[PDB]
Each structure stands twice: as C-alpha cells, then as structure tokens.
C-alpha cells in the first residue's frame, strides 16, 4: 500500500545557529538534516508520491492562533535586529509567577510574553519556514479529505508545543491543531489528535482544552522530569465542555515498548468510544532508544507495529512530523510508521 | 574632612557571587552586575569619610523567611549542586518557564525548578551565589539593627541587589529582597508601619508583590516605563494594591529623556504619599542607574542631583535604611551613591 508525503524545501529557511542548553549556546537539535533524512528514506523506500504544499494563506492558521501572535512571528526578527541585538532572537525575560499577562511594547517583552522557553531561537526565515510547515500539514489534510486514507505531512519546524499564542519547544504554528481545525471547518464533526511524540503535546492540549469536539491525547515522558514540565500531568482532563476530552498518559525513564503499548491501547480505546470522523497523529520518533534527549526504549521495529496499530483504528489519518533527533535513524523510524500503516 | 555619622555595612562575601556569563541580546556575555560595583562604591565611602564601615552580623535564615517562602530558600541553597549533578556544563540559567496557559506547579527536575522560580534568564546562578545572597540580606539586616538601636540612618551596601525578587522568584540580578527583609524586620520589632521607596531606575516589582495585599507596608517606586524596559510585566500606574493593600502601592512611571526636574516631581508625589501614610520607618531601595551616564538609563540625572535626592529624603524626618540596588560601575558610581548619603547628612 502507498501513501503520499507532503514536503516543502522552504523548511531550510529556518537554519538557526544557537540553542540555549545547560547554560551554553550549542548547535540546535532541531536541525535541517532531520527533514532531509526522512525525505531521503521516503524516496528510498518508494513510500509513495512526494508533493510540495499548496499555499493556504494565514486564514487556516488564524483559526487556531491569535492574530497578535501571527503578526509577532512575522515581525519579530526585524524588530530584534532593529533594536540592536546581536544574537539570534532569544527571550531574556518573561511573565514570571506574580506578574501580569499584559502585552508590552518593547521587543524583549513581547518575546517573553509569547514564549515558554529560551531554547527556540528565532532568526531570518523562521516566519517563512513556519508558514511552509503549516501549509504542509494543510495539504496533507486536503489530500485525506479529498480521498486519501492517510497522508504524511513532513513538517519542519514541528508544532505540538505551540499554544494559540505561545511558541516554544522548537514549535511555532501547531501544525496538528491546524489540520485538526481544518477537518472541523470542512464538516468533520469530531476530530482526535493522538500525540505519540516523546514529549507532551502541551500546545495541542491548551488549544482545544475547553472543547469536546476535538479529543486530545498524548503519551509522553513524565513532565515532572522532562519538558514541558508545567503541563502534561495525568490530572489534566479538560475544562468546561472539554472535561474528559483530554487524556495524558505519562511514563518514567527506561519505559519499553511493552509498557508504552499499554498506554497506546488506553489511547486507542478512548478514541474508539469517542468515535471521531478524522485522526491527526502528531508523530515523534524521539521515543527511540537512541534518542539523545529522551528516555524511552522503542526499537526501529516497534515503529512498524505502531503504524500497524494506528491503521487498525480505521480512520482518515494525517501524520504531522514532530520530534526525533537521532539523525541516523530518524528517517528509518518515521517511514517505518508509514510502512507499518500501509501493511508492510 | 572628618568622619561622618552615616555608617555603611559591607560584606566581603559579596565577591562569592562572581558569574562568568549573562544572557543578553541572544549572546552569553560578561555580566553587567560585577563585584567591582560594590568595591568602587566602598572606595568612595572611605575616600569621603562618610562614616564607620562594619561587616554584617549573621542573623540566620529566620528574617529572610519572614519574606521568602521556605521552598524558594531551599531551592537557592541547592540550585548549583543540583545543576552540576544533572550534568549541565554552563552556569545555571533557566531554559523553560511557566508560560501563559501552563500550570504554576513545582516539578522535580532541576530545569523545571529553575524556571518555576525565575522571571528571567539574565541572572546566572553559580557557586557562591547562595552565600553572597545570604551575606547581602545580612548587610540589610545589620543596617536595620543599627537604626533600630539609635542611628538616624544607615547604608546597607548590598550586593547582590534585591528589589526584583518576589517571595519565591529571582531575577533581575536579585535573589533575596534585602529592602523587603529590612522592612519586615522593622515590622517584627514593633515598628507599626514601614514605607519602602524605590528610586532605582527599574520598578521594584519584587517589593510590590511581597506587600501588595498589605496596608502596613507602603511600597512606592519611580522607574522607567515597563512598556519599554524591564520588568515589562509589572510596574504600571494602575497597580494600586489589592484587598487591604488597595491604595498602598504607588508606581510612578517616566519616559525616555526624563530630566531631574520631572523625575523630582514624582519624587515629591512619593514623598507626599509617605507623609500622609506617616510610617515609623523608611527603607530606600537606592539604585543609581538613573544616572545620565548609566548605559541602561534613559533618565538624565547628574551627579549633583544625587545630593539633592539625599537632602529631600532626609526632610521626611524618618529612621531610614538605604539598601544598594542597581547602577553600572561607570567611574561615577561611587560618587553618585555616596552623594545620596552626604546629601542626607547635610552636604
Ligand atoms: N536546549 C534545551 C532544549 C532541550 N529539549 C527541549 C524539549 C523539546 C521537545 C521538542 C519536540 O521533539 O517535542 C518537537 F517536536 F516539538 F520538536
Ligand atoms: N541581559 C539582560 C539584562 C538587562 N538589564 C535590565 C534589567 C536589570 C535591572 C536590575 C537593577 O538595576 O534594578 C538591579 F538593581 F537589580 F541591579
Ligand atoms: K506525546
Ligand atoms: K479537548
Ligand atoms: K524604582
Ligand atoms: K502595600
Ligand atoms: Mg528591551
Ligand atoms: Mg546510532
Ligand atoms: Mg532537565
Ligand atoms: Mg502611626
Ligand atoms: Zn519530542
Ligand atoms: Zn536598576
């Protein structure tokens, strides 16, 4: 069975040089070779047709992200350079506990207001790559809505950590949330977003937190121990009409696929009772045993089983690429999910 | 000239805080809040024979914990050790924090705790930060005791500074809110009410937050517009307190190129608010980064204006503790800070 992949070469326009890590500025983990290695394996395995995204404009993006946030991402680098800063655009101050969530005028204050971390430098081309990556997800969703059983959105930058008006965790536009909202806007009554990336999809959770029409599930490492730290706990089950439409399943270091799979089954069962009309899978392969910044122990073969189990949900499915940082295996791992899904 | 009567408290342990990196404009550069700041001010204290100089008494963490939460104090004692133990190779700097929409929930990992307890990433923690912050609170508390025991005023030559630290948040180069700690010590010793006046260029956000719902401590700050400058998310003029504290916080905000003539009009307003409040003691959070030559200032105070500031503060007629806050160590840093004390003493 074949599956189409949407890939944009514009991802390379985001090529930052610094990442704040352990008190030093290091080479960034979320680097362009990630997207190129997955794309190469897609070709090598003849998974299916590869296409460039169509341009949907900011309309579908602003169905999820606030107008102010979108404007800020467009002008942030220019404002940063104009203000005389010499590094890449990195937050120095933020709304600390006890302060007001009030938007200030200065670039440093806006940059903290709209962020949850300092590891996600902004520079020239970030706006364009974030736009292109959102259009990648939207093209995959159009492919599925127009007849494809599934499509692979090879997004870079990733998306699942981005709130309606907060960037961080290498994410700017929540590609999965945008594709989910695209389904809803096109008449799909109910959408599930399943987050199998190693880290919590905190952005997706926040975006739909008070809603029952989009079910949000994430499996991830314990946020007591890893990013995002301040969301992702198992007591976060929604609010208002969204109560019982968010589900976090956390795991500790050294978790093997046998145990992680038990969490997947719980997720799948919650999807079954929810009975959605479409599925968005925010796919990260940083659950891999050789991932440099994560502590699960999945093997490359386990990604074939993952894709097989997702296919058994029987839903229209859009895969949005999130994390995964072992550059030798990232291509093999991600395409294995797709090949698993296609019965291979 | 003869030795004056304004005593200065100074701890050599301030040099235990001596960090190598500061995040600024996307670069890790040499920090702006250097040990030479306190040494150069101290040299002017000696050179002007302002008064006796003494080392602080050790008061212990008790008076610190009248202002700061126990969890936060424990965090600052262990932060460096936890950071090294987790394998980080740089100084201890927040990478993630409680962004809008996330929970104010304390996590286990050192990275999460660093972010939970911080409002900024320009304030690296390293070895000796705990000890220097402790010594600096003791500097303020020794100054408070000197005034409680009979002195009209004393100068707490604190480093690191304190006015940006909340009960459980550090940032803006500050760890323990020395001014607040001294204000609470006045209160704990039977002074019915205390006013804390912040003349540093930046908003005293920590002090405001600490007493924000209280009427027994009046908090006033003059500062550059937080729309433009740190701390950005507090310090606006509509923050007037809450609950019992309503009308007991006053922020006085100024734009770029503000001259002493206009800054003094806000100082007159602050002094009037202190007069009708009628406190039993006054704590002045003194920054000299209002100086026209301070690299982060956009006020136009001259060195002579600091003499006029000190004279005006004396006219309040209050028992007064000065805690040293900000001010870059351009050549005149000590001239300017000590000018405040000499003007208070009648120069
Ligand atoms: N310098 C310190 C950064 C350490 N790592 C932060 C964890 C972010 C996880 C990102 C991800 O993998 O979930 C995404 F897909 F969004 F990129
Ligand atoms: N790399 C970014 C830091 C730029 N600096 C602005 C905020 C520092 C204000 C501190 C102060 O002057 O109020 C204190 F008294 F605490 F020292
Ligand atoms: K996840
Ligand atoms: K939901
Ligand atoms: K001030
Ligand atoms: K107050
Ligand atoms: Mg600024
Ligand atoms: Mg390897
Ligand atoms: Mg950590
Ligand atoms: Mg009275
Ligand atoms: Zn991840
Ligand atoms: Zn200052």
Residue A233 C-alpha, separation from nearest chain B C-alpha, in angstroms: 10
Q: Please, what is the end-to-end C-alpha distance for chain B in angstroms?
A: 12
Collapsed DSSP state (helix, strand, coil) of residue A59: helix
Compute the distance between CA of residue A338 and CA of residue A318 in angstroms, rounded to an integer.
11
A100/B234 touch (CB, cutoff 8 Å), yes or no: yes
Q: Is A229 a catalytic residue?
A: no
Burial class of residue B276 in the structure, from the number of CB atoms within 10 Å of its CB (0-12 exposed, 13-18 middle, 19+ buried): exposed
Q: Which of B112, B227, B234 minimises the CB distance to A99?
A: B234
Report the nearest-CA residue for atom 10 of ligand 2.
B172
Bridge partners of residue A282, in order along the sequence: A195, A320
Neighbouring C-beta atoms of residue B203, cutoff 10 Å? 30
DSSP string, A118-157: SS--B-TTHHHHHHHHHHHHHHHHHHHHTT-SEEEE--SS
Chain B hits for A85, Cβ within 8 Å: 25-26
How many angstroms is it from B273 CA to the middle of ligand 10? 14
- Contact between residue A288 and residue A300 where contact means Cβ atoms under 8 Å apart: yes
Compute the distance between CA of residue A283 and CA of residue B286 in angstroms, rounded to an integer.
54
Q: Both tokens of residue B268? A: 């007159």
- Contact between residue A116 and residue B102 where contact means Cβ atoms under 8 Å apart: yes
Per-residue HEC secondary structure of B288-338 comes to: CCCECCCCCCCECECHHHHHHHHHHHHCCCCCEEEEECCCCCCCCHHHHHH
A267, A273, A278, A283 alpha-carbon torsion, rounded to 10°: 0
Q: How far is CA B197 from CA A288, B150, B225, B305, in A?
A: 56, 21, 17, 17
B293 is in an annotated binding site: yes
Q: A67-82 vs A126-145: helix axis angle to the nearest 10?
A: 150
- Contact between residue B237 and residue A100 where contact means Cβ atoms under 8 Å apart: no
**Domains of chain B, first to last:** 1-347 (3.40.800.20)
Helices (H), A46-91: 59-62, 67-82
A109/B21 touch (CB, cutoff 8 Å), yes or no: no
How, if at all, do strands B53-54 and B7-9 pair? parallel
Compute the distance between CA of residue A226 and CA of residue B111 in angstroms, rounded to an integer.
8
B121/A92 touch (CB, cutoff 8 Å), yes or no: yes
Compute the distance between CA of residue B204 and CA of residue B209 in angstroms, rounded to an integer.
9
Which residues have CB less than 5 Å away from ligand 3 (the ion)?
A 195, 197, 218, 220
Gyration radius from chain B CA atoms: 19
- Among B254, B255, B172, B257, smallest CA distance to B207 is for B172
- Among A166, A63, A71, smallest CA distance to A114 is for A166
Q: How far is CA A247 from CA A202, A236, A313, A331, in A?
A: 11, 7, 17, 29
- B272 Cβ contact partners less than 8 Å away, ≥ 6 residues apart: none
Compute the distance between CA of residue B326 and CA of residue B278 in angstroms, rounded to an integer.
27
Burial class of residue A270 in the structure, from the number of CB atoms within 10 Å of its CB (0-12 exposed, 13-18 middle, 19+ buried): middle
Q: Which of A88, A119, A224 minimises the CB distance to B95?
A: A119
Collapsed DSSP state (helix, strand, coil) of residue A303: helix
Q: Which of B97, B205, B233 minimises the CB distance to A102?
A: B233
Chain B hits for A99, Cβ within 8 Å: 119, 205, 231, 233-234
Task: Give resolution, Å, one decimal.
Answer: 2.0
Q: Distance from CA of residue B39 to its chain's centroid? A: 17
Compute the distance between CA of residue B22 and CA of residue B173 in angstroms, rounded to an integer.
10
What is the residue whose two structure tokens read 């008076």? B63
- Contact between residue B341 and residue B322 where contact means Cβ atoms under 8 Å apart: yes
Burial B289-309 (b: 16+ CB within 10 A, else e): bbbbebeebbbbbbeebbbbb
Helices (H), A146-281: 175-185, 202-207, 257-274
Q: Both tokens of residue B44? A: 């002017």
- Contact between residue B159 and residue B35 where contact means Cβ atoms under 8 Å apart: yes
Report the nearest-CA residue for atom 12 of ligand 1.
A323
Compute the distance between CA of residue A95 and CA of residue B249 in angstroms, rounded to an integer.
20
B202 is in an annotated binding site: yes
Compute the distance between CA of residue A48 and CA of residue A68 in angstroms, rounded to an integer.
38
A235 is in an annotated binding site: no
Collapsed DSSP state (helix, strand, coil) of residue B180: helix
- Among A55, A59, A57, smallest CA distance to A6 is for A55
Cα-based angle A239, A241, A247 (whole degrees, multiple of 5): 55
What is the residue whose two structure tokens read 């050192």? B110
């Amino acid at each position: 069975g074949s599956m189409k992949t949407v890939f944009s070469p514009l991802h390379s326009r985001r090529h930052v040089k610094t990442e704040l890590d352990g008190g030093l500025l290091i080479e960034p983990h979320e680097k362009p070779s990630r997207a190129e290695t997955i794309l190469a394996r897609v070709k090598d395995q003849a998974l299916g047709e590869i296409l460039e995204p169509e341009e949907f404009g900011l309309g579908p993006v602003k169905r999820v992200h606030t107008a102010d946030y979108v404007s800020f991402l467009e002008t942030c680098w220019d404002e940063w350079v104009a203000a005389g800063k010499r590094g890449e655009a990195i937050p120095t101050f933020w709304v600390g506990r006890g302060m007001r969530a009030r938007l200030p005028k200065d670039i440093d204050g806006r940059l903290g207001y709209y962020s949850l971390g300092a590891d996600t430098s902004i520079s020239d081309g970030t706006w364009e790559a974030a736009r292109a990556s959102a259009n990648v997800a939207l093209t995959a969703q159009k492919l599925v809505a127009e007849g494809e059983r599934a499509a692979f959105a090879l997004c870079r930058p990733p998306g699942h950590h981005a709130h309606a008006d907060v960037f961080g965790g290498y994410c700017f536009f929540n590609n999965a949330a945008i594709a989910a909202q695209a389904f809803r806007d096109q008449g799909y009554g109910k959408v599930a977003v399943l987050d199998v990336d190693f880290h919590h999809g905190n952005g997706t959770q926040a975006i739909f937190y008070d809603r029952s029409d989009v079910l949000t599930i994430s499996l991830h490492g314990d946020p007591d121990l890893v990013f995002p730290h301040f969301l992702g706990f198992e007591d976060e089950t929604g609010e208002g009409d969204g109560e019982a439409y968010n589900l976090n399943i956390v795991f500790p270091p050294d978790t093997p696929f046998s145990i992680w799979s038990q969490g997947l089954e719980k997720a799948c069962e919650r999807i079954r009772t929810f009975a959605p009309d479409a599925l968005v899978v925010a796919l990260g392969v940083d659950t891999f045993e050789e991932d440099p910044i994560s502590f699960f122990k999945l093997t490359s073969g386990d990604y074939l089983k993952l894709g097989k189990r997702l296919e058994q949900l029987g839903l229209p499915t859009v895969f949005t690429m999130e994390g995964g940082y072992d550059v030798d295996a990232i291509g093999v791992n991600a395409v294995n999910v797709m090949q698993g899904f296609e019965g291979k």
